[PDB]
Symmetry: C3
Subunit: 236 residues, 3 copies
């Protein structure tokens, strides 16, 4: 047996299987695409539960003539969608609302229980008439299961995505991504629990802005190894 090829094989497998390890992160990238094709990406990671929580103000395209707009200004625009005649806008804000959201998940994910909840502009459960009395988490619809779309992970057998088209109204996002424990062991049971609790919510988030999707593909997706799908069903 050729040991140079054996070494290559071991190297490949070490990279492919690493996400299955204890304390190895699951990965979440959310991409918002806007009408002129610009993109905003949000990255979250954790080994046990990813909690991808995005305010409606964070999901707006927030660049105006080269400067970043404030939460105050953005929330002012969002308000008129949440409550009738609560701001002074004479036209809509659709230029800054995403057309499409893409959710890229990679790693040792419990695909039965991963939930993606698209919520209202002030964070309440989405419905025709949002109200505090009827506000909850993890609605039945949020569990996508076999509605996830499989994508190449280049040997990892571990990337899927979900896509949604928005309808011209601001939204907020709550994504909960639990670790696969279908090997029959409860990591929250016994003395290990404290070690798991210590690891929750310990990875820095990262938000990036791109003027077009090819910049996203070139400087995020292919830089780090998250495969993305474009509007022509071609992978990058």
């Amino acid at each position: 047996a050729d040991l140079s090829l054996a070494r290559q094989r071991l190297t490949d497998e070490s990279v492919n299987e690493a996400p299955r390890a204890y304390d190895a992160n699951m990965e979440l990238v959310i991409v918002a695409e806007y009408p002129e094709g610009q993109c905003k990406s949000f990255h979250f990671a954790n080994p046990f539960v990813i909690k991808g929580v995005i305010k409606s103000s964070e999901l707006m395209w927030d660049i105006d003539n080269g400067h970043q707009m404030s939460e105050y200004e953005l929330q002012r625009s969002i308000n008129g969608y949440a409550a009738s005649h609560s701001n002074m806008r004479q036209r809509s804000a659709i230029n800054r609302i995403p057309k499409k959201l893409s959710f890229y998940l990679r790693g040792n994910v419990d695909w039965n229980k991963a939930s993606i909840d698209i919520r209202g502009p002030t964070g309440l459960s989405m419905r025709q008439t949002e109200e505090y009395s009827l506000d909850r988490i993890r609605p039945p619809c949020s569990y996508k299961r076999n509605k996830f779309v499989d994508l190449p992970s280049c040997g990892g057998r571990c990337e899927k995505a979900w896509y949604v088209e928005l309808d011209g109204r601001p939204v907020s996002i709550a994504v909960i991504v639990p670790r696969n424990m279908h090997n029959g062991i409860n990591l929250y049971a016994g003395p290990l629990l404290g070690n798991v609790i210590e690891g929750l919510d310990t990875v820095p988030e990262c938000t990036q802005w791109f003027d077009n999707a090819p910049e996203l593909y070139a400087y995020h997706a292919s830089n780090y190894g998250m495969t993305m799908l474009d509007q022509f069903s071609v992978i990058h």
Copy 2:
């Protein structure tokens, strides 16, 4: 029996009782009111533990001639209250410090254990002489219990509030709101624990700015069904 009225009754009860469900959110709205009557509201929600954590810089009225001030500028002003002669201010910043804070809680709350802790300008336990050695959470005074004021929830039997007048010094806030488990069942016990842990800290926050209290009543309180009390003891 009139079935149109029976249907109305069932509908009423479905709305009134929904917050008692597993995975139904408890709701927290904090309102800061400033000397010229403007208001800032902060909304938090969770089914298991609400953690309402606000920095002193976030609690300042932060609008200056139509633009939002930066954390850098706000913290600079706060500093002179925390440490003598640590900024260059020749006058106080009382114009931007809240006069009053109102805490509105709605849902299946453990009223015995809900805690509201008003902390110092850099997040330490409040005392005459703040110091790292004497910094802790959940002081005895923070549990309000029967000092909560009952307010109408329009059939829910589940809203209370707490009020405090400030004394011209910046503060920070830590509110911990645990779920009522007085039905005798520990949701943290057994296999359910992981499901509870997954649900913690998964709801987007929302901050709003209003120029006067009637805007708050019209476009937040009555829009979503949180009853608020004004300075004339009239509900909205």
Copy 3:
């Protein structure tokens, strides 16, 4: 026995031992020092697990002619370090990257398990070639143990520090600081667990900017009782 001295002694001990109490905070101050000597400090606290999580954009010196720069502008500069030719910079950004980081820990810390992880510019595990497949938390190197440096805590016997020199590239930070439970009792075991979970992540953070280290010593360190060490090995 002189009871005025006995009272002094009891007072001293009450202050010295307070951090050992249940619900007493452990304290973390991170100080970034930049080439012109300016400093940024970040304070975190919790009684059970401190989670000090800082994005690469937050660690840049972010003041430009008296105004605070936006995350958009800062992330743009960081991008060129993460992905080749992903921004339009013709020179580096070393003026705004810390030269040195200092980590000050005070309280009832588990020194065996405290971990300080210096991560890449977009939050991934640091390595020559950062990639999503090889991203994890709590690497073996992050546990400093006896590589912590002991510093005076003025009777508390409970402050240590860690120092690192950076190499001109932006980084992100994840610090996990667990409570000392070497007295043989597991606080996550039994009915106490819910009370611990309720206390996680409930203390407001505080970020401060200083133009030079003596301002930091005078208006933070000596104001609150965190001892710091300067470049001459002198304490403040």
